Amino acid sequence: MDGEEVKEKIRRYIMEDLIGPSAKEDELDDQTPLLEWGILNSMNIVKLMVYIRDEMGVSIPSTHITGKYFKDLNAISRTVEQLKAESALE
Known part of the structure; x- marks a missing residue:
């Protein structure tokens, strides 16, 4: 319930673990087309x-x-x- 804290965590994990080379300081942006990069499957x-x-x-x-x-x-x-x-009520 913040948006920004969630985003910065996830985006940076994509840089650390997931990708490797195409993951410079501002490669993964806030609005980056993750599916067009094909990094998510x-x-x-x-x-x-x-x-x-x-x-x-x-x-x-x-x-x-x-x-x-x-x-x-x-x-x-x-x-x-x-x-x-959903998980808060569940």
Whole structure:
């Protein structure tokens, strides 16, 4: 329930673990097309799914995994806060 704290955590983990070479100081931006970079697919996306799960405390269901939310980092976080609300009542 912040947006920014969630985003900066995730985006930087994409730079640390996921990518490697194409992950300079400002390669991964706030609005970067993550799917057009093709960095997010079933192999990679699960390391994010567990990252948000532990760090943000948000259980992302497998049925939630669709392009619109994993499209850019704002779309990532906005839906994390929705799923955070779901997990808050659950």
